[PDB]
């Protein structure tokens, strides 16, 4: 989402209260999970109180409320919070890169680009060229005449 | 004004195909023209 | 004309491949068999193979027609 | 560990394609070159790289769960996160999104029950028949040892040549 | 310059090209893909592999056709125009 951007939009939340960040984080959008997982903060774990919502699944909750701009809380879909291991490129140890870039999608895009290039090459080479089955020798006196010219010019210059 | 000088030459006088390259002679003619003595 | 477009397509494919390789730098662990899209994939592969075979057959038919006309047999035929 | 070889092959193919594109653009002369300068060789290399990638992907079986490992030491030597973040910068990807949508909607993006399942079954039967015929042809042709030739017989006529005694 | 050896090399190249084309066609015929080895993107990798197999089959067919035409021309040269030892047409 907004991992690679550094924009500051404060007009999204007009009332910078405490509950605004939690309300913006609780809203599932688009295909986010509901309040049925275990260990996010305090509220709705189970018939139990792990924390609230950070079990296996899309953990879109308010684990670290940042009312100023937006709820900056990592997913951390596990039993322990405060861990730099999110689905998106977002680390906590001074900022680092992860394996979030999909290799399969990039490989498929490269294969598609290669197929398109092969098709373009076929179209360019079949409609412009043949795809189907369809005296300056120095052996004369110039072999010596050139040397004579060179000598004459070197003499004259 | 601006007096001119000969840039390129051509020699026009055995076999049939005599010669077609004036490269060295043309370069020497250009050098003599640039000398402008 | 077409050389520039071919070079641009090749550069785009190479950039995509380099990005995929960098993201990768297939892996099971120790702790398209879908029968839905594989049908369409096999159909598309058969169509592409049929198109290639049809192009080859058209080229062969053109060659045979050119060989049939004994007026432009410059393909080492009139030479012989 | 089989991904490193495929990535290296892809990088080599990309470098070869870049060299070919540079040679074709520097010597384009504002014209569409179609005399196949390296088009056949480039197509062969692309097909070989694609076959190698498919073989490496389908070699064996031996919201993003990355490899739990330092973990950053495998990609960036030294395990320096600040250096990695500083060298990270030194992009629309609409085709990738279109392919993802086509694969996620119905795995084909067109039709659910009106697909070519019957055509696919006919193609599979034809492929099985062709594979059987090819196996029979291979078993029949694997018996050939060598096509020895024949010529005149000078060795016999030499001793059979007449002489003084 | 080694005319017999040149014809032998041409025939060996043609045989190798035909064998490679046949092997690639047989490999493309075996495109069942009953193993779901792709864990990153199964459908995308499967479609890419199918397209790669189709492109490899097409390239093998094209290489086979080109080798056939080239070997035909080379044999026509080395036999007809080169060693027409039956010069009876001259006497005719």
Strand content of chain B: under 5%
The total of helices of chain A stands at 3
Task: Write the H/E string of chain B, N to C.
Answer: H
The H-and-E topology of chain A, N to C, reads as HHH
Helix content of chain A: 25-40%
Structural class per helix/strand content of chain B?
A: mainly alpha
Profile the largest sheet of chain A.
Answer: none
Structural class of chain A: mainly alpha
Shape verdict of chain B = elongated
Count of separate DSSP helical elements of chain B: 1
GO molecular function (chain D): transcription coregulator activity
Protein name (chain D): Mediator of RNA polymerase II transcription subunit 8
Subcellular location (chain D): Nucleus
Region (Interaction with the Elongin BC complex) (chain D): 121-130
Structural account:
Chain B is 35% helix and 0% strand. With 37 residues, chain B is an all-alpha fold. The relative contact order of chain B is 0.26. Chain C is elongated. Chain D is mainly alpha-helical and 165 residues long. Chain D is built from six helices and no strands. In chain D, helix 1 runs antiparallel to helix 2. The longest helix of chain D is centred in the C-terminal third of the chain and has 25 residues, at 117-141. The radius of gyration of chain D is 30 Å and the shape is extended. Chain E is mainly alpha-helical. Chain E contains three helices and no strands. Chains in contact: A-B, A-C, A-D, A-E, C-D, C-E, D-E. Chains C and D meet through helix 1 and helix 2 of C and helix 1 and helix 5 of D. The PDB classes it as gene regulation. The entry lists the keywords mouse mediator, complex, gene regulation, MED26 subunit. The entry is titled "Atomic model of the mammalian Mediator complex with MED26 subunit". Chain A is Mediator of RNA polymerase II transcription subunit 6.
